[model samples]
Target: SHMEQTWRWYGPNDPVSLADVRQAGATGVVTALHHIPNGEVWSVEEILKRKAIIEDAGLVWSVVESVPIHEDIKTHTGNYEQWIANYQQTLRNLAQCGIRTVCYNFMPVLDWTRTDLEYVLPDGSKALRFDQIEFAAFEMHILKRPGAEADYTEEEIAQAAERFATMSDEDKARLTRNIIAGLPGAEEGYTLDQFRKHLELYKDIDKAKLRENFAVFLKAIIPVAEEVGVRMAVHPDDPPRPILGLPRIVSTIEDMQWMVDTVNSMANGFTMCTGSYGVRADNDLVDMIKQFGPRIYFTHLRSTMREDNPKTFHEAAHLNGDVDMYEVVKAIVEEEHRRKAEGKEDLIPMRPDHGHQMLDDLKKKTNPGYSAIGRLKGLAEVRGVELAIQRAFFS
Candidate 1:
């Protein structure tokens, strides 16, 4: 009777198992066919194999967390049109498997940027944190992006330089790894050389061109998406701003509106990432939810606490951060009401995103934000609040 309860299951390699996902009271699993190469199609053989496993465990593979948009496609270079065609095929293949709700992002080189993966919360639980100056330290001192200085203020450059110098050689290495974070396919030891090469790929494309590329990519995919009944969503940019001089087009309300206007199909939708959008002080989470409403195909419900400025932040508990989650969740439920009355799909698939590393889960080797108990706690919180909202307004 609540929003369809979902949890992210990083199939196989993830520390959390399918049994645990069901144990956590989630009926839907948001995941991907990660083993397949970025630009290649996902053969039905692979999709069914994974689907069987999840179904056998008593969970539905409800959403494709992503089918990555290749870098070649982003810059519109080197057979990108072919890559676009291949992406359409992947969508078709997923549809054949009785799966829809595909999510992807257009963030340039990095998938999601963060400066610290294990910042200490007051209770001693570890959480993901992004310090703007630490990011500056990585850019100017470590990556040495030729003109990195101009991206930051004069004071920030001085502060970042001093901070970089203050860091021990070991700290420098740790910071570098966190900056690279989870690049799409980093399994074979992706290095700074490859990172720099990827950066070089976008040497000429600025914000406007990147936005155009996004629109065109959607124009190519939306028709197939509409025909196949696959909901295509773009996860908003983390930090919701530009970094490393790279163009960030999906960072604001206006930006999201442009995306909706790009493709006029029910299948072309948005993933309302509260963690990413709420990081910006200017973005009103309540307005964001109600405004986007029925177009929000999926939701990631992690809240983040902004520091002194919008640039610095750390993950906050699901219901505890600056994000007005109660109002946000209320807005979402109201939209669902509108959906149900109009004969649309009523269950808006939602997953608790970026839970802190806490409890016994912390004792084991947990993926940065993929710890078991932390997400269980988060899912519980979101579920509790949502239940209350429904009961209070059953009318």
Candidate 2:
């Protein structure tokens, strides 16, 4: 058996339709109530309504991309207790509607930060990328974030300064917009000033405090998730490292082990995003699957090429990046065999994470990294590798 192949659909307003997803050979749809604001309960009516639409289009609503964890809950501050209760209720509603998996992240201020959303590749495709110097320029000159210079080495600071000096006003403004404008189906928007204010909220909270808060949040929700038969998968931090002085708690194998060990429950799970974790040079994707196989309820299979600075990276072709896609698929297939032998549900829902915007997608208005043909290509590549692995081993 193989993982259930899925594609992310941004919902009714998305340029890529359910019909398009089905045509791409994906039987599962990964989405959320993007229209519903953060910190609100996802009512049964809303959940069923979307489910009906997906089912109507010959697709199963396999996972909730997120039921956004309110920022208050992350910081353990005002109204957080109430928010946690609301989250429990939402999970209950989702379970009642037969949706079992939820994918969420705990990054402060941004879901996924990138210095360029449309970095042009050699073949004229556009890929998302993070440039260390460009991000440094934003922090030191544009946002003028306090103590930003200390995060970079002397050489990096000098390079950032030179880059900033050479940038035209338009370049700076575009950089600011690229960093602040929320992606499709992401949380609400933030201006540079507004974003800085949000960052200030976490000024005193470091990695340890954030991890403590995450544990508290998990303790409250994991029982509810188990009670409701919902699997809660926390997504790894994008780029898998500290950026802009924000503490990163979920970027390493050790961090993942801690979270899984903290709850020690099947309901407490992880969304194994190779693209996010693969951005780190030290992360071995194949090893992670072997270690956390049982706890991985969801998967995002994409890859990135780590730059010399280690902080910089660009999304690469699904099979062409530093990640060993073949080994990763082999491990997942082996895990599926184990689940089958144990009489467990073996089809782990996975989506082809981010894709390069290429060919016809470039001419159309589509969400960055979510255009139809690009993702179709990625899905095809991933599925081909997965099938090859299954034939070589499982067959």
Candidate 3:
């Protein structure tokens, strides 16, 4: 198999140790220098420092999880051009260290929000979930941002009102904290008080305008990336939709189709987060892979089980959810085969994203959905499919 199995680790502070990652059968480490602030250059000194640690642990630093896109660059405001220059240099430095595939997202405000970080499942395990009513409640009743009511339908509004009234004070606080704090390693973490003020900055930038800004930056960097031997892959928006009056420009098929067209370079590519795109029924996972097979530089192998509402969902097991894992894996492996024949890079990197909190991990401290045992289980499941697909058909 040409696929490179990898794990995303949050530097040295992560709960899962390097030896733990080594034991999970992943030879590649997907990581970033999180301490370096955004819009600043990730110096060769710092890049090598982190690489030394991973290599010492007997693992290769395969792909940079990301070099964060600064908010100034996203909005094209206040020193954005200069920030874009820094981004180019960051990629150049990463390439110098032999790291090429870089994954990032353009989701404005909060990168990936959920009302609950660890909602217990029926089997005593815990997984992250997005509750539509709970999400609306946070927008209207908790944050209470003006002009927010226009976005929700009357039925959803009433249901959210009822849910808010019945929810305990603790529940409201938890919901607000869960969303406002953002995900671990997410682009921005906000205070509830600053959230509404931060949101005001995007009032004039609708989907069309923001998408144009995204392209401007893409056009600026893809040339630099191409020269530097770097591949920049944009991740799909989490939940794959808009919220909090913010326009999500990278959610639907049309949005993504426009993205690759914006900059036609081998360096400009996409990251397939099946769990995010599967949240909406419109994004056919198999067809998407087939359509953008050569341009897909990385993948997050996980699934989401949409409720009857479809708007609400929880993290499903790797092999069980709305998406068919066997087909998804087949499409991915076939792409590798095509790439190999074309004499392009074929060993695409993959990491199992957002595993459930189960077993002894329930008692230990963990970073949201990133528990060692849970991801070990997910990686094993993904590996099983990769092996079977190669044997049954590709062989």
Candidate 4:
């Protein structure tokens, strides 16, 4: 069977349409209810409506890019049990709509943290980037959560204070907006007050407790996921670091391994975002593949080049970054072979995430990574690489 090739479409309002996705050679569409407010269960009518839109365009809604679990669900606060009930019901609804794979994350706040959305790469193209220093600046100066200054060194905090204290109105505004504008996958964007409220909710729960809550969540939901025939794919932390007094548990493979162990079910799965997991140098992509191969339900095939300072990293060309695409694709193909041999019938869906801004897309008003030319380039690369591996190694 051919591997499912999908694109993350924001919605009808998205600059890139279903037709655009098909023209890009993707028959599968990965999307979700951007129009519906978060934490609400997606009605089957809504799902069928969107499915109709995709099918009308001759595409399959192979995956719901996310059915957002409320922060209450992750933090186990503010009627969390009620929210989980909603989530479970949502999964059942999705299954009814023929959506089997669901993508989500457990990050406390923010999704993919990028200080520079249009950071110019060495190759004269712009891509999203995360700067640890910039985030430190936000934590130390802007959000200024209690005990946050302690997260940084005296010198670092001093520098952040200086940066914060000295920031001009525009720079300060930028920092404020960056923190509040909310990055992708952050669920709903937050205001400064709302963000602080979010932080306070986590105060009583430390990292261990949060992890415990997450484990509990998985334990409860994976069974529901399995029964409903939907696979739950958890995304890794972006930049793979704790930020803004928020505890980040899913940054590395060890954490992911723990998640899988806790759930201990095939329905519990990984999204395997290369750019996200690649932030930390320790994540062994090849090893990760072998360990979680059976549970990797979806993949984000893109790469980032980390700078020594951590405050700054550029999105390198999909193939030329710190992540070795060659090894990654080979491992994926190997996993595919293993699953086939084991008589596993499901094929993982793959999307080229966070592509650079280039070509005609540079001139358009598309979402950052969902741009046309950039993803076309990235997908073409992955397609070629996967084909080459299939040709040379398998045949």
C-alpha lDDT score of every prediction, in listed order? 0.86, 0.88, 0.88, 0.81
lDDT per residue (tens digit) for residues 1-395 in model 2: 24598989988899999988998899999999989878889999999999999999989999999889888988889999989999999999999999999999988777787888889999999998899999999999999988898899998999999999999999999899888878765785788888888888898899999999999999999999999899999899886888788888889899989998789889998899999998887888888899999988899988988889888899999999988888888888888889989987567788987889998899976787888887888889989999888887777
What digit string (tens of lDDT, one per residue) describes model 3 on residues 233-307?
889888888888889987877876897788878788889989999999889899999998788999999999998
Cα RMSD for candidate 1?
1.7
Could you report the Cα RMSD, in angstroms, for every candidate shown?
A: 1.7, 1.2, 1.2, 1.9
Q: Candidate 2 vs candidate 4: which has greater TM-score? A: 2
lDDT of 1 at 345: 54
For model 1, the superposed segments whose C-alpha errors exceed 4 Å read 181-189
Backbone clashes in model 2, listed as residue pairs:
none
Taking the tens digit of each residue's C-alpha lDDT, what string does model 1 give over 149-245? 8888898899898898789989998988877757322222246788888888888899999988888899999999999989987799887888888
Specify the poorest-scoring 10-residue window by lDDT in model 1.
181-190
The runs of at least 3 residues in candidate 3 whose Cα sits more than 4 Å from the true structure, single-residue gaps closed, are: none
Please give the distance, in angstroms, between residue 294's alpha carbon in candidate 2 and its true position after superposition: 0.6
Which residue pairs come into collision in candidate 1?
A: none
What ranking of all candidate models by lDDT puts the best one first?
A: 2, 3, 1, 4
